[PDB]
Each structure stands twice: as C-alpha cells, then as structure tokens.
Amino acid sequence: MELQPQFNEFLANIRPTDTQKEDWKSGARTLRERLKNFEPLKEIVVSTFLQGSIRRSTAIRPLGDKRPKVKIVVVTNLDHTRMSPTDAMDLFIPFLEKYYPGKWETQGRSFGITLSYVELDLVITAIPESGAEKSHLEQLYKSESVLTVNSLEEQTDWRLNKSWTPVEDAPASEWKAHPLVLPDREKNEWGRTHPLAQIRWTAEKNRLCNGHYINLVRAVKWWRQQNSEDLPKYPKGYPLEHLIGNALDNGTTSMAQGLVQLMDTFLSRWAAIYNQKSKPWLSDHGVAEHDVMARLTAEDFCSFYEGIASAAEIARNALASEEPQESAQLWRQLFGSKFPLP
Ligand SMILES: Nc1ncnc2c1ncn2[C@@H]1O[C@H](COP(=O)(O)OP(=O)(O)OP(=O)(O)O)[C@@H](O)[C@H]1O
Ligand SMILES: Nc1ncnc2c1ncn2[C@@H]1O[C@H](COP(=O)(O)OP(=O)(O)OP(=O)(O)O)[C@@H](O)[C@H]1O
Fold it and tell me: Considering Cα of 285, then 29, then 191, then 44, what sign does the dihedral take?
C-alpha cells in the first residue's frame, strides 16, 4: 500500500530537527548582519544569502554528532576579469579574523567556519554583468526573495521575484541567463554558478509534483545513506538530487507511487547508458552548459543503477502489497529503522 501517514512520519523523522534549523538560521543571520555592518566591505559585499540543500529543503539530518553544513553565498560587485578568486577571498580575511578567530579555514573555493552547533560554508561570488543589468541583479539579490533564511518547505508561497513578501516567478529574461561567478574547485579561475536558478527550479518542480519532490529527494538520500556499504560512493548530494529530479515525472500523487515511478523511469531511461558502461550528460538547471555528472564516473553510475534496480524491485513489491504491515516491512527494508509501522 501507499501508507501516506507512515511516509509523513518517516519524512518528519529524517528532516533536520527544529533545533538544527534554528541553529543554522541564527548562524546565517549573524554572519549576514556582521558582513552588512563591516566598514571595509561595505562597498563590496552586495548580498549574503543561504543556499544548498538546506534552503531547497532537500537536506537530511546529519548522523551522530556531525554538524549541518550551512552553505552561504556572498555576492560582491568585484571585477572577475581583473581579480582572481584568491584576491576576492583574501578581501574577507580581516572580517573572519575579527569575528571568527581560530574558527575559520580555507577549504579550496569555500571558507569553512566551525561554529558551536553548525558549520558555515561561505563562497565568494561576483556579478559578471555591468551597468543597468548589474544594478538590477544587485537589486534582486538584495530583495526579500533572496535574503530569506526560511527554506522552501517553510514557505510554499515563495517565488523568485524582487516584489515577493512572506505573485508569480519573475520572467526568465531577468535572471535565467545571468549566473554568478565563483571560484573553481582546483584552478585559481572563475567558474559560473546560478544557485537562484537551481532553487527556483526546485520550487517549481515541487509545486508540479504536489509538494512530493523535496520529500522524495530526502527519502532517496536516506535510502542511499542506509545502504551506503552496498552502493557506490557517488552520486550523492546535488548530483543525486538532480538525478532524482530528472527521473520524477510531474503530477506526483503520493510518496510511494512517486518513488516507484521515479525508480522505474530512472531504470528505463538510462538502461542504454548502463549497457554501454557510460554515464548521462545532464544539463544543470542553473548553468545550462554545465554537466552535473561531470565528475561522476561511469562505474559509479552503473553501480548506482544496479542498486536502483534492487531498490525498485523492493519498492514495487512494497507498493503492490495490500496488507499494511507487509507494505511497512518492505518499506523499512528499503529505508531502515526510522520508518514507522502502523
Ligand atoms: N559551493 C558551491 N556553491 C555554489 N555553486 C557551486 C558550488 N560547488 C559547485 N558549484 C557549481 O556546480 C558546478 C560543479 O563544479 P565542481 O566543483 O564539481 O567542478 P568544477 O571544476 O568547479 O566545474 P567546472 O570546471 O565545470 O566549472 C560548478 O560549475 C559550480 O557552478
Ligand atoms: N555538480 C554540480 N552541478 C550543479 N550544481 C552543483 C554541483 N555541485 C554542487 N552544486 C551546487 O553547489 C551547492 C553546494 O555544493 P556542495 O559542495 O555543498 O555539494 P553538496 O554538499 O552535495 O550540496 P548540497 O548541500 O546541496 O547537498 C549545491 O547545493 C548545489 O546547488
């Protein structure tokens, strides 16, 4: 059966606790307030906004004592053609030493701030556009739509529009073709990322799937976490979320039907790629030219495909079972101890 109440309880059990939520909310608010009132950066920092699976409501709670990774984007007005990423990041060392001495480090393209209950991951970005387009983008990044600390799940009325207040999405000509530039992973060069586009696409897909998309992402992340020793190291994180969003059809009815449908569509759609021992090329919702599966290997994708085949057999039988305890036993075989029984 579908067992929708049990699925709701499982989702509530795999969400980050309200404690951790308030923790990263307070951390982000404090960092933003300190950045806004820092004199040497008052002419540089355009905005500071939350991103990642936390804001997109696609994050699962950490294990053990592990801190929740809080991803923060710092939008500046620097010229990326005349400054390397290391210059932009060096601009922020005084702020860190003043407000987080002994707590901050450089993790390649990000700043890692180890706080008491959370870890703040700060990426330093810039706006490639100039003139009126740059001013309009700065106005958008300083709007309440971007500066919100609540996740997508906490406000279904959220849209990507500078006039939104806690109204539809803004037309695509105002944000789609305008990504930020961030530091590259290895090289000291600027790459392109569009987190706002990703968040807006996630919200749209969740609305098209009747609020089941982010929950299905959480469920598949929890499944991958519980069966980690049988599954490949990757995909996990955003590439996994993208695979799930690609596999899921619109108009999702329930958690169980949506899960079975997404697993079936994943299996049938990539069967040719699997038999060719290859990997899909999937366009990023933020930067169209980017392959989300660029760093994923073919062997890992095929191992994940086999794992999805097994999980899909189990989920099909869990959905087909007409006895509640039987369906629940199969759903727990897929999801583990934190799935409740009727
Ligand atoms: N911490 C982050 N914050 C915002 N965007 C990110 C972050 N990490 C990755 N991205 C986006 O996702 C993509 C994944 O890039 P990854 O770090 O896996 O390899 P890369 O060498 O940076 O990619 P490329 O060379 O293709 O730009 C990046 O192009 C970037 O646009
Ligand atoms: N390969 C990629 N393609 C497109 N966007 C990416 C990619 N990798 C990361 N990003 C973007 O950069 C953000 C930060 O990436 P991070 O390095 O934290 O990976 P992650 O921990 O898997 O992300 P998340 O916290 O969202 O699961 C992600 O939320 C995502 O929006």
Answer: positive
How many residues in the chain? 342
Regarding the beta carbon of 53 and ligand 1, being less than 6 Å apart is answered: no
* Nearest to 294, CA basis, from 212, 216, 204, 191: 191
Resolution of this model in Å is 2.7
Report the structure determination method: X-ray
Q: In this structure, is residue 202 part of a structural domain? A: yes
Which residue CA neighbors atom 4 of ligand 2 most closely? 292
Within a domain: residue 342? no
> Hey, what are 286's tokens?
């933020």
CB of residue 292 inside a 6 A radius of ligand 2: yes
Whether 331 and 3 have beta carbons less than 8 Å apart is answered as yes
Q: Is 114 left (phi over 0), alpha (psi -120 to 50) or beta?
A: beta
Q: Whose CA is nearest to atom 22 of ligand 2?
A: 237
Distance CA 279, CA 273 (A): 6
> For the chain, what is the domain count?
1
Domain range for 313: 4-335
Which CATH number is 243's domain given?
3.30.460.10
Residue 340 within any structural domain of the chain: no
Closest atom of ligand 2 relative to the 195 alpha carbon:
31
